[PDB]
Amino acid sequence: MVVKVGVIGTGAMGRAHIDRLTNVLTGAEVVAVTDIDHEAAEAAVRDFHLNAKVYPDDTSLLQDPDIDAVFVVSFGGAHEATVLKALDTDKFIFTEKPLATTLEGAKRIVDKELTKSKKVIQVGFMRRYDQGIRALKEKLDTGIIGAPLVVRASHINPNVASNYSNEMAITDTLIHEIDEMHWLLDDEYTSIQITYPRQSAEVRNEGLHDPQLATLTTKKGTVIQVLVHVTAQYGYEVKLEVIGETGELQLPNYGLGPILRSNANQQTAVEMSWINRFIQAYNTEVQEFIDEVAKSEPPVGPSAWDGYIAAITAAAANRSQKDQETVLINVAGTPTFYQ
Amino acid sequence: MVVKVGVIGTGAMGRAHIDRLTNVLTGAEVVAVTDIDHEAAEAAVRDFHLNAKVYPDDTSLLQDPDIDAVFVVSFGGAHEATVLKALDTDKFIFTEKPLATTLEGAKRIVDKELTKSKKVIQVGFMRRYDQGIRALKEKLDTGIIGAPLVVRASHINPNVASNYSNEMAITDTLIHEIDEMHWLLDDEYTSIQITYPRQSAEVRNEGLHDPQLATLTTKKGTVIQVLVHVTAQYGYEVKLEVIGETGELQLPNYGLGPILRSNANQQTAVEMSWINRFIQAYNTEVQEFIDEVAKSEPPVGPSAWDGYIAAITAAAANRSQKDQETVLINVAGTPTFYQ
Amino acid sequence: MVVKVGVIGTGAMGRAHIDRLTNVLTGAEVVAVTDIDHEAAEAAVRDFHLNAKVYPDDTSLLQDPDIDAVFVVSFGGAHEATVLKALDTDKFIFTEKPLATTLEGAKRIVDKELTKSKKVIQVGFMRRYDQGIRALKEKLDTGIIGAPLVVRASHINPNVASNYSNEMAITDTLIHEIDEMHWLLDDEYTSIQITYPRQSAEVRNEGLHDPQLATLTTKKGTVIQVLVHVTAQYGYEVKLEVIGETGELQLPNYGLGPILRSNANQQTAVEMSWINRFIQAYNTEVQEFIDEVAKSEPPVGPSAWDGYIAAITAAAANRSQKDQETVLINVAGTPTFYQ
Amino acid sequence: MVVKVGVIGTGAMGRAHIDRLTNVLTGAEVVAVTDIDHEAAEAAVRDFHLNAKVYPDDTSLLQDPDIDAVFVVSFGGAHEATVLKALDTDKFIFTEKPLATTLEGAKRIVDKELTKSKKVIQVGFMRRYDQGIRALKEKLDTGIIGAPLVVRASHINPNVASNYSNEMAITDTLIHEIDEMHWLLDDEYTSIQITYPRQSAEVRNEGLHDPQLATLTTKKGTVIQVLVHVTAQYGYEVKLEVIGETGELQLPNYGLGPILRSNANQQTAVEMSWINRFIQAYNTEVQEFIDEVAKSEPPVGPSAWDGYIAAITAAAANRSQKDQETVLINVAGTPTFYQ
Ligand SMILES: NC(=O)c1ccc[n+]([C@@H]2O[C@H](COP(=O)([O-])OP(=O)(O)OC[C@H]3O[C@@H](n4cnc5c(N)ncnc54)[C@H](O)[C@@H]3O)[C@@H](O)[C@H]2O)c1
Ligand SMILES: NC(=O)c1ccc[n+]([C@@H]2O[C@H](COP(=O)([O-])OP(=O)(O)OC[C@H]3O[C@@H](n4cnc5c(N)ncnc54)[C@H](O)[C@@H]3O)[C@@H](O)[C@H]2O)c1
Ligand SMILES: NC(=O)c1ccc[n+]([C@@H]2O[C@H](COP(=O)([O-])OP(=O)(O)OC[C@H]3O[C@@H](n4cnc5c(N)ncnc54)[C@H](O)[C@@H]3O)[C@@H](O)[C@H]2O)c1
Ligand SMILES: NC(=O)c1ccc[n+]([C@@H]2O[C@H](COP(=O)([O-])OP(=O)(O)OC[C@H]3O[C@@H](n4cnc5c(N)ncnc54)[C@H](O)[C@@H]3O)[C@@H](O)[C@H]2O)c1
């Protein structure tokens, strides 16, 4: 059956999700929208040729009984209250990251979801759906390189907007690695530490440190070293290397474009857009959500608990940024509801 | 505006198309099927949970006024007659390759289609939709390596089934390159020549020469050298290199799997399945066709004329296979209907 | 013994050999030079800090009894007469390829050398000494990919000098591949065919066809397809791929330079000359020559016979250049003197 | 004329240097040896066919006035005294790393050499002479990626012998990076910290932690992250990546062995031996030293000052190894004598 969707927040990512659901993926229809900028919501209806109702707020949209699921794609800070409202309904919930902007708000959502008769929240941590990353995890899990000892990763971005802040290096950028690594390793974190190498001359934003180095430790003792570099200029790139007892695994270079021989060099193109980089993952993640809703089954993607783990770890990281000191992490055991 | 499809031939590729149309792609629905093996048609309905009618034959399916387009996915030798029948209707037509198993058959098709007020046939030459191959063409077309002088290509397959004949090295295998190269180069063929290097010990099929070397010449003078190697053992691989005046372009290695460092080697996996290799292309190809039907606009993919060029070239190659001599190709000028 | 060397021809490769003999290799001193351009000769003595006589011609240099060995590093068309004159002395002779530019010339050299009491000529077929090419051969010879069915090779140069003729595409360039493949495969040729693809707009030399395609067949039925492209612009490159029954072997990309990520690309430098690409091979071959001379023993590297065998195939190709037709080859057995 | 060399310590590396000087490189002769294992010394003369004197000790060797330069290749702990003895002569001195096993020792050497009229000591830090590493440095120095912000490196070794200690991870392994980085960056170290991820199950040696992570900071703020992994199993590998403001540079794939396509994989061999990995660099290093001596000019390779920087940094790392805490480094400004 067709999954009828309401979308809350019709900005860049909201419109991208509307486009997915309407023009790319199978089995869904967007039938309602809302945005605090009402004109943006109307524009989304026009631009995507939707047979949709425009509601003036989330509360109103959420009382539409025809909606099967909502996508929450507003400002991060607005996710918590909207998700909590939606939990008073029967509707399935896809929220973009973050689940909430504080670990307390995340706990609030978890606590409330726990009272329900089924899990209904999926969180937009798309990395887990990327075919390359998944393939590396799968190979790791065969045991072929033994136990993972060290993980080295990079999150490379060409430049940022004038409103990108130091804390966003964590909450908008590193958050992807924060969710990814515990999943990749099937392990839990014990600490995080953010350090600041020399400041790049390319930074244009007051207060923003770039690059930043993140070191995470896990219970089994695997150490993760992530380089975050958001004014790198050259491209957008995600790199991942796992060092094992008996071997190594790494992601191959991204891209399908040709190898060019020209002008005394051999070269391949580098993606400039995070959008194009993860297009597959976004499509896969959403398709899976829709596929679950269609069966009235709980989502199988990243959950509220995953959202909580990320929010705890982000908070620790933002703390670490103040003085570059290691911050401990100790998250509670995973509820059965969430295993 | 859902495009209602009937499928003629519900074998391996028929089912794969149904699956695409039903479960992966957007905007279509399979509402009718037929197969000379009636039990197979019924199973396709059951298997994909279709709301569809099973027809005794193609003629009867084609009388269904609710069908907007047919997919022709029967044995190759049956394509011609079915396509001709379908052209007595107003429906759009997607036929898998070949357009016809003889060039005269292909011409009968083109001649008949030319009598219509608009073009309705797309032929399933999916190479044109593979992202890697397209990306290469695109880069070529920027002029960055100058004019293409030589193309070197490989079509590598690990092993073949007992039904695989010498002529199939052309009709099943090289056919993809035969369609591809004229498109890549925006050119027309003038000759083809097949030569036989030493016979591989891995050949278990009567009459089969393997490997085979195909040399094609074009009007602008580009020489195309394709290695066809169908008992190669190691994997399935499609390679493409364009030699230009001022540089070269080549396809990168296919695959997203990790790089493994282990046991004194660095390695990546090689695909063993052509099916897997071209998933994307099949999806893109079909989604385009569906998208054009949804607008009641002619297909923009490979056409009946392309099918014709393929058939003529394939015939010439089969002729060359007899004595390893060069066979001339003189393709008629493209009718404006097909421009 | 320190081997006292004279060099005839002090252009690009003459200088390079003087450099290696003086500054890198052991057991040699350049004590005399000549070039038809006296200024070039003088420049070599100066630039390499030699204590060397500058002779007005080859004949005078050859009559200096203090010289132990001569290097012939002139224009290829000049090697024949110089080598024949040197055979009138008891000096050891290292000649760059080709041995001669005609079959008749190479045969004269062999006929004269055969009258001597001991073998004294080494020909500069350096490919045989290149560690990478040797490594490939060794792997091939283990049987890991089965029998070699097809060889694909490229010989790419960025540009040529004004004295480079169509005929030199064979005698100066393809000659390397002519020698190499016989050695690689331990097989002999039965035919060669040269074809002319689309003429490059980058050609600046009257009468030169570029690129050229060479097809060589062996007794065992291996087919070799060589691309010769001497106005390629982008760089200098040698490529080698061996297609076997059960796998393939390929020479890797040569390069020491770093991988640069910059400006939406990932790139590595390509060599622009032979002089650095094959420095190891040249060093190895020349050191081996010197080491034999020091012992007054015959060279063990490629001989005048190897040069003659190559010249036969080369002459066949020069014949093929005229009409693009296949020319047969059947070389004589190796004389005892040369075994 | 020939540089006459004495060798003190005729063990594995001493013999290998003798081989370099005798068989591989040009312009030197080993005329004297000494070892505390007087039979070792005797073996070297014999096995390499030296016309050399066996001296009963280093003091006696150094009194031989016909010796131009000495190679100090004894146990590391024995370098300091032998070096200071040799500084009571006028001889040139090549000492393998370390200059000394204590930072106090290295300081004594520095202090004595600075009394002398000219520099005579070179220390065997061969990384600087590796072609790839050198090419990367030079590219970095063009400014093409802007200022270096972070360096990421790996020193990967497959297994270690029984005698390999925790401290040797620094003194024998990381020491190469310790020398390399400040030279690469033209900067000075301000701190080092050694951390221990989970212990690999492959470790068989008491007290050895493996892997180890080393973090170094420099005066300009560059952060260097080195992974040291000596029980890695898969191979010997040196990796290096420089993260700049506007791009990145990294070492290319190493190796000249063939690419093998076989059994559903594409693979290349990995070096298993550091010995083979750095053959070129050792040759280059020693040839330069000899070339300098030959013209009676001071060495231009790594100096005693470099040896002292290494000793200090190694000491700080050994200190850090105790508690995983950061240890500051404050290196005195370079004496004018050492530039
Ligand atoms: N997972 C990913 O990789 C990924 C990437 C991009 C964005 N995101 C998530 O996107 C959400 C959307 O980001 P964006 O880039 O689209 O930003 P945006 O600014 O473009 O859009 C948000 C849109 O938010 C609407 N809005 C704000 N508050 C609202 C509220 N309380 N109720 C309803 N609408 C509200 C804003 O008016 C607007 O139209 C964030 O949580 C962002 O982090 C995730
Ligand atoms: N483009 C590609 O890469 C690609 C790949 C695979 C197949 N194909 C095309 O597939 C067609 C299908 O191949 P396949 O692999 O599915 O083979 P198949 O043997 O599995 O299936 C064909 C199915 O054909 C049915 N059939 C035969 N004649 C029929 C007829 N006259 N009317 C209705 N049904 C008929 C057969 O009974 C069967 O169920 C061919 O043209 C094949 O070349 C193209
Ligand atoms: N084996 C290799 O990889 C390799 C590479 C480059 C060149 N070569 C061989 O180089 C020879 C030299 O080529 P090059 O690149 O140095 O070219 P070049 O043009 O740079 O130099 C040849 C030099 O030849 C001198 N010369 C010409 N005729 C002479 C004669 N009769 N007697 C004495 N000197 C004469 C020319 O004046 C000149 O100084 C050829 O045989 C070339 O094929 C081999
Ligand atoms: N730079 C490199 O990469 C590299 C590599 C290997 C070794 N090294 C340096 O090698 C020195 C030699 O190492 P090795 O592997 O050959 O060790 P080794 O144990 O094999 O050899 C040293 C030889 O030292 C002789 N010897 C010891 N003390 C002596 C003394 N006081 N006077 C004279 N001879 C003495 C030993 O008896 C023996 O004959 C060390 O400093 C080692 O670190 C450097």
Check whether residue A162 and residue A251 sit in a common domain.
Answer: yes
Check whether residue A292 and residue A232 sit in a common domain.
Answer: no
Contact D280, D135 (CB under 8 A): no
> What is the DSSP secondary structure assignment for residue D252, as one 8-state letter?
P
d(CA A265, CA A288) in angstroms, rounded, equals 42
Nearest residue to C50 via CA among C65, C68, C32, C74: C32
Contact B174, B195 (CB under 8 A): no
Q: What is the DSSP string of D4-44?
A: EEEEE--SHHHHHHHHIIIIISSSEEEEEEE-SSHHHHHHH
Distance of CA A100 to the CA centre of its chain: 12
Locate A154 and state its tokens.
Answer: 């990079």
Q: Would the CB atoms of A253 and C268 count as touching at under 8 Å?
A: no
Integer-rounded Cα Rg, in Å, for chain D is 20
> What is the DSSP secondary structure assignment for residue D170, as one 8-state letter?
I
Check whether residue D287 and residue D250 sit in a common domain.
Answer: no
User: Token pair 């933002």 is at which residue?
Assistant: A318
> What is the DSSP secondary structure assignment for residue D212, as one 8-state letter?
E
Check whether residue A133 and residue A280 sit in a common domain.
Answer: yes
Check whether residue C94 and residue C10 sit in a common domain.
Answer: yes
Report strand pairing: B69-72 vs B92-95.
parallel
Ligand 1 pocket test, candidate residues A37, A60, A75, most atoms within 8 A of CB: A75
Q: How many CB atoms lie within 10 A of CB C159?
A: 15
Q: Would the CB atoms of C234 and A263 count as touching at under 8 Å?
A: yes
Check whether residue C30 and residue C123 sit in a common domain.
Answer: yes
Check whether residue C229 and residue C118 sit in a common domain.
Answer: no
Q: What is the strand order of the sheet D3-8 is part of?
A: D53-54, D28-34, D3-8, D69-72, D92-95, D121-123
- What does this entry list as its resolution, in Å? 1.6
Q: Which residues are bridge partners to A338 per DSSP?
A: none
d(CA B259, CA B63) in angstroms, rounded, equals 54
Q: Which long-range contacts (CB under 8 A, 24 or more apart) does D282-288 make?
A: D282/D16, D282/D20, D282/D126, D282/D129, D283/D20, D283/D24, D283/D25, D284/D126, D284/D129, D284/D131, D285/D124, D285/D126, D285/D128, D285/D129, D286/D17, D286/D20, D286/D21, D286/D25, D286/D94, D287/C24, D287/D25, D287/D26, D287/D27, D288/D129
CA atoms C278, C233, C259, A275: torsion sign: negative
d(CA C179, CA C309) in angstroms, rounded, equals 8
Does a cis peptide bond (omega within 30 degrees of 0) precede residue B65? no
Check whether residue B273 and residue B317 sit in a common domain.
Answer: yes
Contact D326, A195 (CB under 8 A): no
d(CA B212, CA C50) in angstroms, rounded, equals 56
d(CA B87, CA B166) in angstroms, rounded, equals 33
Contact C188, C199 (CB under 8 A): no
Nearest residue to A11 via CA among A69, A56, A75, A99: A75
User: Of all helices (H) and strands (E), which one includes residue A42?
Assistant: helix A38-47
Contact A191, A121 (CB under 8 A): no
Q: Would the CB atoms of B243 and C211 count as touching at under 8 Å?
A: yes
d(CA D234, CA C286) in angstroms, rounded, equals 36
Q: How many CB atoms lie within 10 A of CB C322?
A: 9
Locate B152 and state its tokens.
Answer: 């070197």
Half-sphere exposure of A248 (CA within 13 A, CB side): 28
Contact B215, B203 (CB under 8 A): no
Contact A9, A35 (CB under 8 A): yes
> What is the DSSP secondary structure assignment for residue D173, as one 8-state letter?
I
Q: Would the CB atoms of A135 and B251 count as touching at under 8 Å?
A: no
> What is the DSSP secondary structure assignment for residue D132, as one 8-state letter?
H
User: Of all helices (H) and strands (E), which one includes residue A182?
Assistant: helix A175-185
Ligand 4 pocket (Cβ < 6 Å) reads: D 8-14, 34-37, 40, 58, 73-76, 78, 96-97, 124, 126
Going by CA atoms, what residue is nearest to atom 24 of ligand 3?
C74
CA of residue D307 to ligand 4 center, whole Å:
16
Helix, strand or coil, per DSSP, at residue A63:
coil
A9-to-A16, A65, A91, D337 alpha-carbon distances in Å: 11, 19, 17, 68
Q: What is the DSSP string of A284-338?
A: HHHHHHHHHHHTTPPP-SS-HHHHHHHHHHHHHHHHHHHHT--EE--PPPPPGGG
Half-sphere exposure of D319 (CA within 13 A, CB side): 16
d(CA D124, CA D289) in angstroms, rounded, equals 10
Nearest residue to C237 via CA among C256, C254, C261, C260: C254
Contact D52, D30 (CB under 8 A): yes
User: Token pair 């899976």 is at which residue?
Assistant: A288
Helix, strand or coil, per DSSP, at residue C275:
helix
Distance of CA A274 to the CA centre of its chain: 12
User: Token pair 């398709």 is at which residue?
Assistant: A287
Q: Which CATH number is B232's domain given?
A: 3.30.360.10
d(CA D172, CA D174) in angstroms, rounded, equals 6
Helix, strand or coil, per DSSP, at residue D238:
strand
Query: In angstroms, how far apart are the furthest CA atoms of chain A?
Result: 65
Locate B199 and state its tokens.
Answer: 């016979």
d(CA C57, CA C72) in angstroms, rounded, equals 12
How near does any CA of chain D get to the CA of C146, in Å? 11
Residues 6+ apart with CB under 8 A from B315: B102, B103
Residues 6+ apart with CB under 8 A from A86: A58, A62, A70, A72, A93
Select from A268, A288, A306 the last residue of a domain. Answer: A268
d(CA B284, CA A256) in angstroms, rounded, equals 15
d(CA A48, CA A79) in angstroms, rounded, equals 24
3-class SS string, chain B: CCEEEEEECCCHHHHHHHHHHHHHCCCEEEEEEECCCHHHHHHHHHHCCCCCEECCCHHHHHCCCCCCEEEECCCHHHHHHHHHHHCCCCCEEEECCCCCCCHHHHHHHHHHHCCCCCCCEEECCHHHHCHHHHHHHHHHHCCCCCCEEEEEEEEECCCCCCCCCCCHHHHHHHHHHHHHHHHHHCCCEEEEEEECCCCCCCCCCCCCCCCEEEEEEECCCCEEEEEEECCCCCCCEEEEEEEECCEEEECCCCCCCCEEEECCEEEEECCCCHHHHCHHHHHHHHHHHHHHHHCCCCCCCCCHHHHHHHHHHHHHHHHHCCCCCCEECCCCCCCHHHC
d(CA D226, CA D186) in angstroms, rounded, equals 18
d(CA D160, CA D177) in angstroms, rounded, equals 18
d(CA A307, CA A338) in angstroms, rounded, equals 11
Going by CA atoms, what residue is nearest to atom 29 of ligand 1?
A74
Helix, strand or coil, per DSSP, at residue C19:
helix
Q: Write the Ramachandran bin of B221: left for phi over 0, alpha for psi from -120 to 50, otherwise beta.
A: left
Distance of CA C85 to the CA centre of its chain: 21
Contact A122, A299 (CB under 8 A): yes
Helix, strand or coil, per DSSP, at residue C190:
strand
Q: Which residue of C has its CA nearest to D260?
A: C249
Helix, strand or coil, per DSSP, at residue D327:
strand
- Pick the ligand that lies closest to the CA of residue A175: 1
Contact D250, C259 (CB under 8 A): yes
d(CA B54, CA B56) in angstroms, rounded, equals 7
Contacts of B229 in chain C (CB under 8 A): 149-150, 243
Phi, psi of C50 (to 5 degrees): -95, 155
Q: Would the CB atoms of B261 and A247 count as touching at under 8 Å?
A: yes
Half-sphere exposure of B33 (CA within 13 A, CB side): 30
d(CA C235, CA C250) in angstroms, rounded, equals 19
How near does any CA of chain C get to the CA of B198, in Å? 5
d(CA C304, CA A80) in angstroms, rounded, equals 85
User: Token pair 């029980």 is at which residue?
Assistant: D231
Contact A174, A209 (CB under 8 A): no
**Length of chain A measured in residues:** 339
Locate C120 and state its tokens.
Answer: 């004294």
Residues 6+ apart with CB under 8 A from B86: B58, B62, B70, B72, B93
Half-sphere exposure of B198 (CA within 13 A, CB side): 21
Q: Would the CB atoms of D149 and A231 count as touching at under 8 Å?
A: no
Select from D268, D290, D322 the last residue of a domain. Answer: D268
Helix, strand or coil, per DSSP, at residue A170:
helix
Check whether residue A259 and residue A287 sit in a common domain.
Answer: no
Report strand pairing: B237-244 vs C259-262.
unpaired
CA of residue D182 to ligand 3 center, whole Å:
44
Q: What is the DSSP string of A251-295?
A: PPPP--PPEEEETTEEEEE----HHHHTHHHHHHHHHHHHHHHHT
Check whether residue A328 and residue A205 sit in a common domain.
Answer: no
Give start and end residues of each alpha helix (H) in chain D: 12-19, 38-48, 58-62, 79-86, 103-113, 131-140, 168, 175-185, 274-277, 279-294, 304-323
Locate A6 and state its tokens.
Answer: 């309401």
d(CA C195, CA C327) in angstroms, rounded, equals 12
Contact B203, C146 (CB under 8 A): no
Contact D5, D70 (CB under 8 A): yes
Q: Which CATH number is A118's domain given?
A: 3.40.50.720
Report strand pairing: B189-195 vs B327-328.
antiparallel
User: Token pair 């002459």 is at which residue?
Assistant: C315
> What is the DSSP secondary structure assignment for residue D172, as one 8-state letter?
I
**Length of chain B measured in residues:** 339
Q: Which long-range contacts (CB under 8 A, 24 or more apart) does A276-281 make?
A: A277/A236, A277/A238, A278/A126, A278/A127, A278/A130, A280/A129, A280/A130, A280/A131, A281/A126, A281/A127, A281/A128, A281/A129, A281/A130, A281/A131
Nearest residue to A217 via CA among A156, A150, A155: A150
Check whether residue D132 and residue D6 sit in a common domain.
Answer: yes
Amino acid identity, residue A9? G
Report strand pairing: D237-244 vs C223-229.
unpaired
d(CA A129, CA A111) in angstroms, rounded, equals 26
Number of folded domains that form chain B: 2
From the number of C-beta atoms within 10 Å of its C-beta (0-12, 13-18, 19+), residue C296 rates as exposed
Q: How many CB atoms lie within 10 A of CB B264?
A: 16
d(CA D75, CA D54) in angstroms, rounded, equals 19
Locate A127 and state its tokens.
Answer: 């990395």
Locate A288 and state its tokens.
Answer: 């899976």
d(CA A20, CA A287) in angstroms, rounded, equals 9
Phi, psi of B72 (to 5 degrees): -100, 105
Check whether residue B122 and residue B3 sit in a common domain.
Answer: yes
Domain that holds residue A227: 144-268
Select from A228, A251, A268 the last residue of a domain. Answer: A268
From the number of C-beta atoms within 10 Å of its C-beta (0-12, 13-18, 19+), residue C18 rates as buried
Q: What is the strand order of the sheet B69-72 is part of?
A: B53-54, B28-34, B3-8, B69-72, B92-95, B121-123
d(CA A323, CA A315) in angstroms, rounded, equals 14
Helix, strand or coil, per DSSP, at residue C256:
coil
Phi, psi of A40 (to 5 degrees): -65, -40
How near does any CA of chain A get to the CA of D202, in Å? 7
Find the helix packing angle between B175-185 and B304-320, rounded to 10°: 120
C328-to-C274, C314, C319, C323, D113 alpha-carbon distances in Å: 31, 11, 10, 14, 73
Q: Where are the beta strands (DSSP E) in chain A?
A: 3-8, 28-34, 53-54, 69-72, 92-95, 121-123, 148-156, 189-195, 212-218, 223-229, 237-244, 248-250, 259-262, 265-269, 327-328
Q: What's the CA angle centered on C63, arms C8 and C12, to 5 degrees? A: 5
d(CA C256, CA C271) in angstroms, rounded, equals 10
- Pick the ligand that lies closest to the CA of residue A79: 1
d(CA A20, CA D190) in angstroms, rounded, equals 51
Q: How many CB atoms lie within 10 A of CB C216?
A: 26
Report strand pairing: B212-218 vs B28-34.
unpaired
d(CA D314, CA D103) in angstroms, rounded, equals 9
Find the helix packing angle between D12-19 and D38-48, rounded to 10°: 30
Locate C307 and state its tokens.
Answer: 């040069």
The dihedral over CA atoms of A305, A311, A313, A317, expressed in degrees to the nearest 10, equals 170
